[PDB]
Amino acid sequence: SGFRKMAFPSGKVEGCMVQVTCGTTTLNGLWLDDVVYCPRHVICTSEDMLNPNYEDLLIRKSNHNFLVQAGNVQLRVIGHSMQNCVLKLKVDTANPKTPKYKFVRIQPGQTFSVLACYNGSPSGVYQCAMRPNFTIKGSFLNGSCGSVGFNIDYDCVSFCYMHHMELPTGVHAGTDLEGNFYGPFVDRQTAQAAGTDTTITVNVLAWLYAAVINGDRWFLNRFTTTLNDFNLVAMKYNYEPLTQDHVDILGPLSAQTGIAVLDMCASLKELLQNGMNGRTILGSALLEDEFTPFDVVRQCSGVT
Amino acid sequence: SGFRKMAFPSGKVEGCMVQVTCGTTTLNGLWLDDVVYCPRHVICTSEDMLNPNYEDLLIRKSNHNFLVQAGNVQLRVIGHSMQNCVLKLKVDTANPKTPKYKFVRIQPGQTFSVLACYNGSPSGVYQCAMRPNFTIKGSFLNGSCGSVGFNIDYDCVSFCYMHHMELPTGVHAGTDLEGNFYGPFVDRQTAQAAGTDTTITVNVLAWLYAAVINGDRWFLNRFTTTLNDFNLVAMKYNYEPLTQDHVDILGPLSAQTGIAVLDMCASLKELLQNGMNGRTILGSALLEDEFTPFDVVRQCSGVT
Numbered sequence: 001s002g003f004r005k006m007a008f009p010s011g012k013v014e015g016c017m018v019q020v021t022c023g024t025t026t027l028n029g030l031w032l033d034d035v036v037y038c039p040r041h042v043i044c045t046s047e048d049m050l051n052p053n054y055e056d057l058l059i060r061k062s063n064h065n066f067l068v069q070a071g072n073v074q075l076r077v078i079g080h081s082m083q084n085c086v087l088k089l090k091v092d093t094a095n096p097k098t099p100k101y102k103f104v105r106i107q108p109g110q111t112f113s114v115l116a117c118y119n120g121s122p123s124g125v126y127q128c129a130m131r132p133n134f135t136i137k138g139s140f141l142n143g144s145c146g147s148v149g150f151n152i153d154y155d156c157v158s159f160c161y162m163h164h165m166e167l168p169t170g171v172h173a174g175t176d177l178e179g180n181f182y183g184p185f186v187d188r189q190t191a192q193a194a195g196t197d198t199t200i201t202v203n204v205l206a207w208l209y210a211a212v213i214n215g216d217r218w219f220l221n222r223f224t225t226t227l228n229d230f231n232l233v234a235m236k237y238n239y240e241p242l243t244q245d246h247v248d249i250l251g252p253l254s255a256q257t258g259i260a261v262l263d264m265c266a267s268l269k270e271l272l273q274n275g276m277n278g279r280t281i282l283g284s285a286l287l288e289d290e291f292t293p294f295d296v297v298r299q300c301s302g303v304t
Numbered sequence: 305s306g307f308r309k310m311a312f313p314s315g316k317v318e319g320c321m322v323q324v325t326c327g328t329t330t331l332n333g334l335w336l337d338d339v340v341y342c343p344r345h346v347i348c349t350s351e352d353m354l355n356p357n358y359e360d361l362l363i364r365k366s367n368h369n370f371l372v373q374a375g376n377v378q379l380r381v382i383g384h385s386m387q388n389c390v391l392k393l394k395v396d397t398a399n400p401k402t403p404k405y406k407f408v409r410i411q412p413g414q415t416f417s418v419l420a421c422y423n424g425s426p427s428g429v430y431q432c433a434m435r436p437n438f439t440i441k442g443s444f445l446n447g448s449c450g451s452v453g454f455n456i457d458y459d460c461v462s463f464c465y466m467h468h469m470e471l472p473t474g475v476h477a478g479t480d481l482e483g484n485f486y487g488p489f490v491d492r493q494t495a496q497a498a499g500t501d502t503t504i505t506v507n508v509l510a511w512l513y514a515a516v517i518n519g520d521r522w523f524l525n526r527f528t529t530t531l532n533d534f535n536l537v538a539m540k541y542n543y544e545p546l547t548q549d550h551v552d553i554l555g556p557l558s559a560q561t562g563i564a565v566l567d568m569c570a571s572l573k574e575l576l577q578n579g580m581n582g583r584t585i586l587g588s589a590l591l592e593d594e595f596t597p598f599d600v601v602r603q604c605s606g607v608t
């Protein structure tokens with residue numbers, strides 16, 4: 001029993017983190033096979049970041065200008081290319097700790113673990129969601145650039161995020177491992193404002209199911225609703241619309257608890273309209289939206 | 305910027321987890337050098353757990369009755385002993401992934417990371433505190449027994465907790481790595497009720513400092529207080545008494561922010577008396593107490 005904001009064990013990713021330095025800029029790289037992936041930011045001065053022309057800045061850079069250090073051993077760079085907003089540095093040594101891996105582009109509302117790194121060295125691990133406005137709410141200081149987000153399916157690491165930057169509002173933006181930003185963000189130090197950070201409704205519902213499974217039941221009410229009625233209330237409270245696809249995804253939690261998804265929606269509707277009245281659910285005074293239905297099943301079933 | 309509930313990178317501990325089976329009971333062991341540490345519970349049936357005599361149960365057990373598997377390779381048990389509530393199984397192979405390590409007994413209010421494991425396999429990592437009633441609020445299913453809690457200082461893992469059991473209230477109790485329970489708990493399936501789960505005041509203050517550093521400042525007020533005045537309010541709200549030792553520990557955060565500790569106490573006093581009025585601090589609607597002053601400095605400074 002008990003329900004925690006749980007990250008994947010980070011060991012497989014720790015084995016992939018390196019330091020990348022270009023001139024005076026140091027950040028983190030991801031070493032998979034004989035390729036180090038890092039933000040193309042590695043080539044900018046902070047001056048450059050106001051209006052960088054990355055193709056033009058990159059002409060001035062040779063293989064030997066990219067210093068890649070794995071622990072306290074230097075890797076030899078034998079090639080480099082820009083793919084979207086990442087650099088791929090070809091090194092002469094395959095990472096011997098390369099796990100089975102994939103590159104995946106996640107959807108908003110999907111959760112993942114972040115291994116926060118500085119100078120190629122892991123500092124901590126925490127669990128994030130891709131927000132509906134394609135930001136994440138991370139913990140990243142200067143030097144954390146190139147830290148990665150990931151899911152693990154048994155022995156396969158799915159890399160979904162690389163950290164590039166902090167918006168003036170102190171929320172975070174980054175890319176998939178093909179170098180494509182999530183959302184409309186660019187790797188330039190300019191006016192970039194996030195859209196509405198809506199609540200990930202299907203995740204809140206999943207977490208309410210987790211609460212019931214773990215004995216927190218006070219919020220269960222005598223009502224039901226419909227998707228259309230619930231969605232009118234969702235819209236008013238800046239919750240994402242709930243679709244039949246979300247209802248289908250919550251089916252196994254519905255089955256395990258015997259609470260119909262639309263009944264849990266009606267409980268959630270009352271919590272939105274009435275508030276918590278100073279009560280807590282799984283030690284929270286707000287409705288948690290950074291657990292997916294898959295996360296709740298995993299943590300409630302003990303998957304390794 | 306941003307502030308997350310962050311665990312230590314788990315790789316160094318992942319390398320130490322094994323499966324221990326005795327008869328029909330499987331749980332997790334910690335493999336350091338040529339010793340596997342596991343809950344003495346490994347020898348009980350669930351029937352046994354109602355009133356176990358561990359010395360008597362252990363007479364019936366030989367080295368060959370303890371099955372230790374590291375990945376899919378069996379370790380040879382060449383000796384076994386009971387130390388308090390843990391078994392030490394001597395194996396014929398030193399763990400080649402043994403990190404630098406210490407065994408430490410933490411105080412209430414100290415935080416640590418838990419690597420939740422099942423069948424010797426890591427499932428997740430999350431951050432815990434030793435509660436003032438010597439419980440922890442974990443996420444542990446059947447089979448999670450022997451999962452460990454730890455801190456890391458650069459390259460040295462300090463092991464502070466091993467998971468033994470769940471109280472009927474769904475909170476958790478365990479031992480240090482010498483096999484001594486935190487608090488008054490015993491490894492028997494009996495009436496064990498936790499005392500008052502008070503709030504770790506010095507940790508709340510640390511987290512309010514983290515909030516100020518990260519731009520959440522709305523709760524800063526025009527008041528100050530004294531330790532004695534604050535403590536009258538703390539007692540009323542089931543907060544731990546704040547000592548001058550806690551004030552001293554918060555000194556560096558005081559210095560960094562320029563908010564006197566007693567001023568932050570007065571802000572906290574107003575939050576206790578007035579509530580949050582539906583506002584959040586670092587994305588929380590309650591006062592978080594599972595960050596130590598050391599945690600806040602570490603996460604705010606980017607220590608690896």
Ligand SMILES: Cc1cc(CN(C)C(=O)NC2CC2)no1
Pocket residue numbers: 025026027140141142143144145163164165166305
């Ligand atoms: C603060 C903060 C920084 C970041 C990522 N970033 C832009 C950097 O690390 N820049 C340094 C490496 C040249 N995210 O939040």
Ligand SMILES: Cc1cc(CN(C)C(=O)NC2CC2)no1
Pocket residue numbers: 001329330331444445446447448449467468469470
């Ligand atoms: C639920 C729950 C279980 C636990 C730890 N424990 C008692 C076990 O794993 N018992 C199984 C191994 C024989 N903590 O919470």
